[PDB]
Structures are given as structure tokens and as C-alpha cells.
Amino acid sequence: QEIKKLVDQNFKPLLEKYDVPGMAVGVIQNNKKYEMYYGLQSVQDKKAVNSNTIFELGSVSKLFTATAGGYAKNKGKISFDDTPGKYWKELKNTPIDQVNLLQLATYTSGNLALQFPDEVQTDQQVLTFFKDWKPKNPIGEYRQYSNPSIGLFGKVVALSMNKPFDQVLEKTIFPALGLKHSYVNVPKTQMQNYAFGYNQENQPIRVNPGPLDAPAYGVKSTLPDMLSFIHANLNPQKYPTDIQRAINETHQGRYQVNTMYQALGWEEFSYPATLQTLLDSNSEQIVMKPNKVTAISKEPSVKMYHKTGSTSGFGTYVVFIPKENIGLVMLTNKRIPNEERIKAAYVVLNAIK
Numbered sequence: 001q002e003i004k005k006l007v008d009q010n011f012k013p014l015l016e017k018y019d020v021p022g023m024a025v026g027v028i029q030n031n032k033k034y035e036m037y038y039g040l041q042s043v044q045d046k047k048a049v050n051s052n053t054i055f056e057l058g059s060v061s062k063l064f065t066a067t068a069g070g071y072a073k074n075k076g077k078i079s080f081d082d083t084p085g086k087y088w089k090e091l092k093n094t095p096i097d098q099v100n101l102l103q104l105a106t107y108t109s110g111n112l113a114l115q116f117p118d119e120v121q122t123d124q125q126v127l128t129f130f131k132d133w134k135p136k137n138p139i140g141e142y143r144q145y146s147n148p149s150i151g152l153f154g155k156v157v158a159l160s161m162n163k164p165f166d167q168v169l170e171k172t173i174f175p176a177l178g179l180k181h182s183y184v185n186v187p188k189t190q191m192q193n194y195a196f197g198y199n200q201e202n203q204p205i206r207v208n209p210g211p212l213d214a215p216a217y218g219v220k221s222t223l224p225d226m227l228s229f230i231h232a233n234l235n236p237q238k239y240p241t242d243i244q245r246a247i248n249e250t251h252q253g254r255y256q257v258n259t260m261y262q263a264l265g266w267e268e269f270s271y272p273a274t275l276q277t278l279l280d281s282n283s284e285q286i287v288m289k290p291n292k293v294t295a296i297s298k299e300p301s302v303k304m305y306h307k308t309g310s311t312s313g314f315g316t317y318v319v320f321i322p323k324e325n326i327g328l329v330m331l332t333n334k335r336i337p338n339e340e341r342i343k344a345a346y347v348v349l350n351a352i353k
């Protein structure tokens with residue numbers, strides 16, 4: 001194959017350009033996996049990145065939250081027209097027991113920001129924050145990307161299965177996806193495999209506990225595991241029917257913001273997509289500001305899906321195209337610009353032609 005050469009030409013230069021210590025790039029094509037490893041999981045230890053290296057997925061964790069929601073919608077445990085009060089008994093008749101589970105999951109409450117305020121930390125300050133919530137935009141009309149929005153979806157999904165969110169992933173979702181080294185909490189036996197992240201001053205760091213962190217950005221995984229996740233997204237037919245259902249649920253577009261369709265967790269596009277369309281989904285306009293949605297008008301015949309993710313120390317990108325039977329995963333232990341991630345992947349996936 002030329003896959004190794006294409007990844008070297010497009011991903012490898014980025015390590016020197018952004019002083020990234022380590023990178024794992026995976027490609028899956030026609031059911032065959034390719035794994036490319038570069039550099040170091042730990043600078044101080046001179047430990048090489050390899051197939052056992054655990055990275056922070058950041059906002060790619062939202063795809064797991066969405067899958068978890070899809071699984072609970074299919075076991076009859078929740079409905080996407082329901083509201084959080086039906087599960088968080090404590091939150092009835094507040095202006096937020098008026099937002100649906102789908103609207104939380106898809107960022108359209110109309111007044112929820114990217115982050116909680118710093119003072120919000122304990123379970124008791126989170127329970128308190130949602131009661132005081134009040135609308136601003138007409139519900140359902142405006143997309144603002146948001147950790148609290150999908151985090152609340154996550155806790156509500158977990159209440160429905162009667163389990164804390166971490167056990168829903170580690171006991172139900174991850175095993176159903178055949179993932180063997182994916183974690184919300186990395187155990188002791190695996191700590192030697194958890195990479196250091198590196199901040200913009202090249203100091204070693206890992207993610208800080210934060211409010212509703214697990215459902216919004218708290219999953220850690222390996223390249224083989226993410227390639228399996230992509231495999232399952234490219235082929236849900238082979239998987240247990242419960243998880244198959246869950247997966248198809250995350251692929252359904254719910255609304256448009258120009259050329260971007262919002263699905264559950266995933267961002268969806270018409271394929272082939274221009275580079276600029278993919279970059280727009282990660283523009284300041286799209287990620288950081290409110291944008292008014294529209295109903296899907298053009299239902300694309302052939303679709304592709306992506307998502308970026310970051311913690312302070314780590315970068316992640318995942319993209320797949322069902323009807324070329326291909327996909328790519330990039331994991332780094334230092335952030336690089338979202339646009340760089342999206343472009344390299346673009347060149348590589350087009351060249352496997």
C-alpha cells in the first residue's frame with residue numbers, strides 16, 4: 001500500500017511544525033486497519049507511542065455520550081421528546097424541564113455556553129446551576145456548542161439506565177463496541193500506558209476533574225480502540241442489535257447550519273465535501289458563537305461524518321465515509337490547530353482513490 005507513505009507525507013511534518021511529542025494515526029479501509037506511530041508518549045521517560053498508548057479524546061468523548069443515548073432510546077429507557085425532570089426528579093417546572101433530551105444533545109436550549117462557570121464544581125453546584133437557567137433565544141432555533149448541554153443529556157441518559165455515567169460506558173457501551181482499553185477512569189494497571197499531554201509551554205499535564213466532565217470530554221482511548229469504533233460506525237450490521245440501533249441513531253441528521261448537518265455527537269456532511277466545508281464546521285463562527293439553525297432541506301445521498309476534540313494537553317480527530325468504506329483517526333499529545341487536523345485527513349482519504 002501507499003497508506004503508510006501518504007500518512008508520512010501529511011501527518012508526520014506536523015510534529016516538527018507544532019513541537020508535538022507524539023502522534024498515532026490510524027486508517028481503516030475495506031476492513032483492513034493501518035496504524036502509524038510517531039514519537040513519544042512521555043518526553044521525560046523516552047517512552048515511544050505504540051498501540052498500548054492511552055490518549056485523552058476531549059470532545060470526541062461526545063460521540064460515546066451520543067451512542068449511549070442512542071442505546072437508551074432503543075432499550076425504551078428514554079425518549080428524545082422527554083425532558084430531564086422525568087429522570088432528574090429534582091428539576092421539574094424549572095425553565096429547563098421545558099427543553100427536550102434531543103435539544104440538550106444537539107446544543108439548542110438557546111442559552112447554554114461552551115463551559116460551566118469556574119465556580120461550578122460539586123454535584124450540589126451543578127444541580128443548583130440548571131434551576132436558575134432562563135431562555136434567551138427561542139428554544140430550538142439557535143445552535144451554540146456546549147459542554148453543560150450534552151453533559152446534562154449524559155447524566156439523564158445515565159439516570160435512565162440506573163447507573164452512574166462511567167459504568168454505562170465501561171460496563172455497557174465499551175464492551176458492546178468491542179473496545180478493550182477505553183476508559184472514563186484509567187485504572188492503576190494501565191497508568192504506565194497513559195500518555196502525558198503537553199501544554200503550549202511543553203509541560204506535561206493530564207485532564208483536571210470538572211463538572212459533568214465524563215460525558216462532555218472525559219474518555220481516554222488507544223489507536224486500536226478508536227479504529228474499532230470507526231469500524232463499528234462504518235458497519236453497524238455486524239454488531240449486537242442494541243448497539244447497531246444506537247449507532248444508526250447517531251448518524252441521523254437533525255438540522256442544518258449551512259453545509260453542516262448536526263447529528264447526535266457527529267457532524268454530518270454531503271460527500272464529496274470540499275475542504276472548506278469541513279473547515280467551516282470548526283470556524284469561530286460555528287464553534288464559539290450562536291447560529292440560527294434550519295431544517296434539513298437537501299437530504300444528502302452519500303454522507304461523511306467527523307468530529308474534533310481537545311483537552312488542554314491532547315488533540316483528536318475522527319472522520320469516516322460509509323460508502324468508500326474508509327475512515328481515519330488522529331491522536332496527539334499536544335493540541336494542534338483543528339484546521340491542520342482536518343486538512344491532512346482530507347488529503348489522505350482522497351488519495352486512497
Ligand SMILES: *[B]([O])([O])[C]([C]C1=[C][C]=[C]C(C([O])=O)=[C]1)[N]C(=O)[C]C1=[C][C]=[C]S1
Pocket residue numbers: 058059060114147217282287308309310311312338
Ligand atoms: B471539545 O474539545 O470541543 C471541548 C471544547 C473545546 C476546547 C478547546 C478547543 C476547542 C475547539 O477549537 O474546537 C473546543 N473541550 C473541553 O472542554 C476540554 C478543554 C480543552 C481545552 C480547554 S478545556
